[PDB]
Curated annotation (Swiss-Prot), chain B:
One of its GO terms (biological process) is neural tube closure. Keywords: Acetylation, ATP-binding, Cytoplasm, Disease variant, Hydrolase, Ligase, Multifunctional enzyme, NADP, Nucleotide-binding, One-carbon metabolism, Oxidoreductase, Phosphoprotein. Trifunctional enzyme that catalyzes the interconversion of three forms of one-carbon-substituted tetrahydrofolate: (6R)-5,10-methylene-5,6,7,8-tetrahydrofolate, 5,10-methenyltetrahydrofolate and (6S)-10-formyltetrahydrofolate. These derivatives of tetrahydrofolate are differentially required in nucleotide and amino acid biosynthesis, (6S)-10-formyltetrahydrofolate being required for purine biosynthesis while (6R)-5,10-methylene-5,6,7,8-tetrahydrofolate is used for serine and methionine biosynthesis for instance. This is C-1-tetrahydrofolate synthase, cytoplasmic. The active site is at K55. Changing S48Q: Reduced methylenetetrahydrofolate dehydrogenase (NADP+) activity by 75%. Reduced methenyltetrahydrofolate cyclohydrolase activity by 99%. No effect on affinity for NADP and 5,10-methenyltetrahydrofolate. Ubiquitous. In the N-terminal section; belongs to the tetrahydrofolate dehydrogenase/cyclohydrolase family. Changing S48A: No effect on methylenetetrahydrofolate dehydrogenase (NADP+) activity. No effect on methenyltetrahydrofolate cyclohydrolase activity. Decreased affinity for NADP. Residues 1-280 are annotated as: Methylenetetrahydrofolate dehydrogenase and methenyltetrahydrofolate cyclohydrolase (D/C) domain. It comes from Homo sapiens (Human). Changing C146Q: Reduced methylenetetrahydrofolate dehydrogenase (NADP+) activity by 50%. Reduced methenyltetrahydrofolate cyclohydrolase activity by 87%.
């Protein structure tokens, strides 16, 4: 009785298709309304160009007007700040994000930049104000970071109620771990957060009916650690050379999949689990912002 | 035989004496300068009145100038917003707070009212900005709620390091439970947060080397559930006055325990004063 596989690629395709339909209906219900996203980039990193082009492409297919603002490396902090203030003020933009990390020849305080974003437009959900709302239970209107939002969605796809269950989150980062605890807590699970200073991590992991691991340590969580029948969510994206693969490299998660799949009732594969879910989540957050403005 | 008693009244007395000397020196460095705190109240709840009096009394004894504004029960959210804006703009007021719960005959969104407060004066640490910083580990730039602060201080009085310990926080409110989890987490403990939807609560509480209870249910946490040698912090104030933990039983299992009264209560006001003296010192800098 091996674990059922949570196909992130398929589930995300479903999500994006439904969002397209919603966007089509919003525009027909309110003629002239145009859900709009904006991405602010500083510099010209190759990886950022790739990530951005993927976000813009997904936005255009759903019917969301996506605006890409690309500033040169010579940009200063005051200029980046000016754009954020203008994006906040632009009533035609419902949600925007600053693509990280910034690429400039000058010193720019990343935290001050991010925190200048108007909370009601913070689709990536990383501002302190938004993090503060999510941490204290304002799930009805705050924004949720794309990765943990995709994790909760995958957990809900199992059909197993979260309330009353014991969930373990290995990792406590701003991007994943912390907001993941927040989603699980406010969905009424009893949550235990682990990290690099956690003693007897194996014994802790073994107590989770729902397990979300986001550590960046390739396959550290062994199958033996998994609680029998648990829902395992693996956010890990670790590269390992493998000449038997088309591009000479494989992607493994933070969980030892092959042995964990024999213990859990539901498990996300890597690649193809949490990863494909992220862009869809940003698109969902964008639509949410558009609908809250429209109301 | 019983657990060591964490005397919050003696410890807070030492903190207050310390803060007093600090305030006295600040005035000697800058004569005429006076750290000022303001407490805004809506309504006339008897318990809120006594709580405010205690805070006013501790401020006076430390040398802090405290102002109490009491609004009638007919107050609207709009009017409360006018006082909050006035207090944000009043340069002589270094730190202010809105007494909770608001006692009005009209609906007033408490979060909107609290979030109108300027974060630099949010000595109660209830704004979404301060909550967000604490929630993500940015402890350099924020005010932490006075109750979780007092609890952390009480835990440190045991002399036992927090890092690596499995901590259990029973309760998740904005005032105590949620920020308490954060403080423990960022102090490197492995933290479990329990609430009303927690199944097998007795089994969860039994895993805690550090146990903080803030539920408001009279002596609901049984001593049987306590892990032998645990540090028990009890934030409960229930009506005789009792905590959220069955003290007589828990004291025979714990290594360190907070009594009620004279435990977390005093420490809470001492920490509020500490955050106030801090907001006055960040203003001079
Ligand atoms: N699907 C996507 O596109 C997506 C998006 C974001 C992230 N991810 C993946 O998620 C992973 C985690 O990212 P992150 O932002 O959370 O990074 P991070 O900032 O480095 O987070 C690591 C966290 O795990 C803890 N930790 C480190 N080693 C551990 C260990 N050996 N045992 C227990 N805990 C350990 C650390 O504790 P301390 O706080 O004490 O340091 C820290 O909280 C990365 O591999 C990344 O590839 C995927
Ligand atoms: N020392 C001080 O001066 C100070 C300052 C403030 C407060 N306190 C004290 O702290 C206590 C709690 O305050 P609060 O603002 O957090 O209260 P609250 O708003 O009523 O919150 C109680 C929390 O505990 C949970 N809970 C209720 N019954 C429970 C049960 N039987 N088992 C497990 N969890 C239960 C609730 O879960 P749900 O969210 O699911 O409902 C809720 O999260 C009060 O007794 C108060 O006197 C002390
Ligand atoms: N929501 C909310 N709930 C609360 O319980 C409070 C609050 N807000 N705001 C203010 C806060 C006041 C904190 C406080 C608690 C106890 C004491 C105190 O000194 N207690 C004495 C006993 C006093 C007596 O009743 O005679 C002690 O030794 O514990 C002082 C401040 C209470």
């Amino acid at each position: 009785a091996p674990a059922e596989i949570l196909n992130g690629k398929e589930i995300s395709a479903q999500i994006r298709a439904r969002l397209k339909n919603q966007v089509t209906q919003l525009k027909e219900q309110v003629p002239g309304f145009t859900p709009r996203l904006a991405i602010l980039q500083v510099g010209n990193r190759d990886d950022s160009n790739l990530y951005i082009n993927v976000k813009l492409k997904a936005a255009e297919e759903i019917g969301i007007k996506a605006t890409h603002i690309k500033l040169p490396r010579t940009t200063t902090e005051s200029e980046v700040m000016k754009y954020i203030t203008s994006l906040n003020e632009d009533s035609t933009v419902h949600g925007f994000l600053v693509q990280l990390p910034l690429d400039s020849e000058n010193s720019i305080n990343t935290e001050e930049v991010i925190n200048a974003i108007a909370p009601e437009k913070d689709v990536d959900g990383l501002t302190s104000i938004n993090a503060g709302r999510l941490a204290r239970g304002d799930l009805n209107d705050c924004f949720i970071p794309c990765t943990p939002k995709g994790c909760l969605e995958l957990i809900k796809e199992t059909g197993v109620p979260i309330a009353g269950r014991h969930a373990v989150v290995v990792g406590r980062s701003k991007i994943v771990g912390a907001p993941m605890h927040d989603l699980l807590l406010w969905n009424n699970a009893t949550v235990t957060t682990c990290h690099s200073k956690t003693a007897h991590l194996d014994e802790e992991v073994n107590k989770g009916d729902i397990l979300v691991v986001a550590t960046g340590q390739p396959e550290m969580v062994k199958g033996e650690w998994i609680k029998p029948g648990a829902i395992v969510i693996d956010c890990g994206i670790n590269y390992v050379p493998d000449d038997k693969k088309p591009n000479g490299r494989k992607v493994v998660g933070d969980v030892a999949y092959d042995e964990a799949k024999e213990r859990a009732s539901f498990i996300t594969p890597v690649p193809g689990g949490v990863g494909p879910m992220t862009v869809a989540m940003l698109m969902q957050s964008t639509v949410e912002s558009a609908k809250r403005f429209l109301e």
